[PDB]
Swiss-Prot record, chains A, B:
The chain holds residues 85 to 140 of 533 of the full protein. Expressed to high levels, and with a high degree of kinase activity, in certain fully differentiated cells such as neurons, platelets and macrophages. Isoform 1 is widely expressed. Isoform 2 is expressed only in the muscle. It comes from Gallus gallus (Chicken). Belongs to the protein kinase superfamily. Tyr protein kinase family. SRC subfamily. The phosphorylated form is termed pp60c-src. S-nitrosylation is important for activation of its kinase activity. This is Proto-oncogene tyrosine-protein kinase Src. Non-receptor protein tyrosine kinase which is activated following engagement of many different classes of cellular receptors including immune response receptors, integrins and other adhesion receptors, receptor protein tyrosine kinases, G protein-coupled receptors as well as cytokine receptors. Participates in signaling pathways that control a diverse spectrum of biological activities including gene transcription, immune response, cell adhesion, cell cycle progression, apoptosis, migration, and transformation. Forms a complex with polyoma virus middle T antigen. Interacts with AFAP-110. Interacts with GJA1 and PXN. Residues 2-57 form the SH3 domain. It is found in: Cell membrane; Mitochondrion inner membrane; Endosome membrane; Nucleus.
Length: 57, 57
């Protein structure tokens, strides 16, 4: 649904959205789902992941 | 907590994590929070946003 920006955010990459405080933002339905910052116990690498790609142990 | 990868994912950017099916992933506590794909009604731009930066209308 509709949300409002509480703070300014400047994009740090290619896919993230820059926005100013007060902007009206609308959540897009995405197949990937919410993105989580995750650490791999298998490889030791760390980064953002799509939540729909994983499941609890 | 601990999660397992259901599918392979190849990183498309600089900050996302590549992982193979079966890897054990651990969610990192992040100040930014979950990242959502959002569309701005103010600017018309669209991209990923940190959920902790916004609030419901």
């Amino acid at each position: 649904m509709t949300f409002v920006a509480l703070y300014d955010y400047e994009s740090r990459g290619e896919t993230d959205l820059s926005f100013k405080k007060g902007e009206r933002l609308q959540i897009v339905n995405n197949t990937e789902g919410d993105w989580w910052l995750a650490h791999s116990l298998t490889t030791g690498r760390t980064g953002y992941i799509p939540s729909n790609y994983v499941a609890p142990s």
